[PDB]
Design an enzyme around this catalytic site. Structure first.
Site, PDB file in Angstrom:
ATOM      1  N   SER A 103      25.954  46.067  56.552  1.00 33.47           N
ATOM      2  CA  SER A 103      26.669  45.395  55.205  1.00 33.47           C
ATOM      3  C   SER A 103      25.288  44.903  54.333  1.00 33.47           C
ATOM      4  O   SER A 103      25.793  44.224  53.217  1.00 33.47           O
ATOM      5  CB  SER A 103      27.473  44.351  55.716  1.00 33.47           C
TER       6      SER A 103
ATOM      7  N   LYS B 192      25.963  46.154  50.818  1.00 20.74           N
ATOM      8  CA  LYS B 192      26.786  45.422  49.845  1.00 20.74           C
ATOM      9  C   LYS B 192      26.071  45.071  48.680  1.00 20.74           C
ATOM     10  O   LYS B 192      26.485  44.696  47.480  1.00 20.74           O
ATOM     11  CB  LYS B 192      27.516  44.460  50.492  1.00 20.74           C
TER      12      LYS B 192
ATOM     13  N   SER C 146      31.805  39.925  54.176  1.00 24.25           N
ATOM     14  CA  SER C 146      31.547  41.339  54.483  1.00 24.25           C
ATOM     15  C   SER C 146      32.612  42.424  54.703  1.00 24.25           C
ATOM     16  O   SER C 146      32.738  43.084  55.603  1.00 24.25           O
ATOM     17  CB  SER C 146      30.579  41.332  56.005  1.00 24.25           C
TER      18      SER C 146
ATOM     19  N   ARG D   4      20.575  35.618  64.056  1.00 20.96           N
ATOM     20  CA  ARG D   4      20.023  36.232  62.696  1.00 20.96           C
ATOM     21  C   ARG D   4      19.615  35.060  61.679  1.00 20.96           C
ATOM     22  O   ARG D   4      18.447  34.780  61.379  1.00 20.96           O
ATOM     23  CB  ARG D   4      20.911  37.115  61.869  1.00 20.96           C
TER      24      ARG D   4
END
Ligand SMILES: [Cl-]
Lengths: 241, 241
Positions: free
Chosen positions: A50, A53, A98, A226
């Site tokens: 993603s 994007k 997302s 993350r």
């Protein structure tokens, strides 16, 4: 004399603290110098998932597939596993949550010929859209490394990509993730069932720090690592308090 | 039929809690309905003070006085009482720290004729720039009410002001104050030694709440009450957690 890229292996402690493996890459825009815990992994190209994007938004805006950040893309009525996807979205909320199906529709409208041409213009990763135009970033042939993500993000920050300034400004708005009196973070997460990504930058009063991280992600339970691991690096380097 | 404007005097408790007096005005964009603790004061006109940095920035950008949000305005070397003013600034940091001398320079470059013409085109308050070209928003003839601030801010949000879309996007970026997974606040504080303002909006996933507040501000010690009281109203109305 000094090097464009330095390795700081002390950041490994932030991965080993969570029994995890990965790379954080930082770029100090004022000093024109980069830093990473693992130069080899920093240059290893992975599916963007993603994080795609970002370029997908830019292309959709520049071609008029997305008219502006307020245009509503109605839910198609198919109940999917992620509850936030089962509602209407605009560009801002589709990026925040997302929302793959919204971006799949953008990609089909862009079409393969324009998608390939624009990724070449962007110098984006290996520029390979093999697979389906509406899933290549999830299960197709496109690959991009953390340092390639930095390069792309720096062009976006400086309005240097080969799309309009307006498209670049809208996407940077949509990337807004966190802001306070100390810093602004513009970023995008990604996850492909095997690795997780977080890429973006931290704006300070008098500097910008670009970042790109990826890590092994065997289950979704660790997705919050993350941001947490990235922020531990940012804190250690005194970029954020 | 339903009421466009409603008075909620229970918000007065947030002012009396601090022995203060003022007005908060909220506008629910989806419902096209407004709410305030004081209908009269909501429509009374005051000096805009540093909230004028919003239209001043738009005009400077549209006329090319400021090229972009990165252009540096170097400190003139005069040590002023506010430490953050004693440094180089760009548009982002000049708005963040409300750097009066930077905006006085913008106003001198714009000049009286173009400043008056642009405020007329903006329908901004009483449209009256009487006084010094570089201080009329602090000690001259310009006046604007909280409801007029909302109407101006709504036009800015929708890119409907009589300057370029680019100028409007740059100023909305510069207004960024706070952001997290629950909301985004774009706003500007003001203070004229007598009245304090906070004006802007709160972006949610599926709505935007515009706000404009002013309050009696006899001393700078209470400047943080502008945000604190506004946030108590926002929390009471379940707009932010
Ligand atoms: Cl923004």
């Amino acid at each position: 004399g000094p090097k464009e890229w330095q390795e700081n292996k002390s950041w490994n402690a932030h991965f080993t603290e969570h029994k995890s493996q990965g790379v954080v890459v930082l770029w100090n825009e004022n000093k024109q110098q980069g830093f990473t815990n693992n130069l080899k992994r920093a240059n290893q190209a992975f599916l963007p998932a993603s994080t795609f994007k970002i370029p997908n938004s830019l292309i959709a805006l520049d071609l008029g597939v997305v008219k502006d950040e307020h245009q509503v893309f109605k839910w198609d009525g198919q109940t999917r596993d992620i509850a936030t996807w089962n509602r209407d979205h605009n560009l801002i909320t589709a990026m925040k949550y997302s929302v793959v199906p919204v971006y799949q529709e953008f990609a089909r409208q862009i079409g393969e010929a324009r998608m390939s041409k624009m990724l070449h213009a962007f110098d984006y990763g290996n520029e390979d859209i093999s697979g389906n135009v509406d899933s290549f970033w999830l299960d197709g042939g496109i690959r991009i490394s953390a340092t390639e993500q930095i390069s792309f993000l720096r062009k976006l920050y400086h309005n240097k990509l080969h799309v309009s300034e307006r498209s670049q400004r809208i996407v940077k708005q949509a990337m807004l993730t966190e802001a306070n009196g100390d810093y602004i973070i513009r970023a995008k997460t990604g996850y492909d069932t095997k690795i997780g990504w977080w890429v973006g930058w931290v704006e300070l009063d008098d500097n910008v720090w670009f970042f790109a991280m990826n890590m092994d992600m065997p289950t979704s339970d660790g997705l919050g690592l993350r941001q947490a691991i990235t922020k531990e690096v940012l804190k250690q380097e005194k970029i954020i308090p």
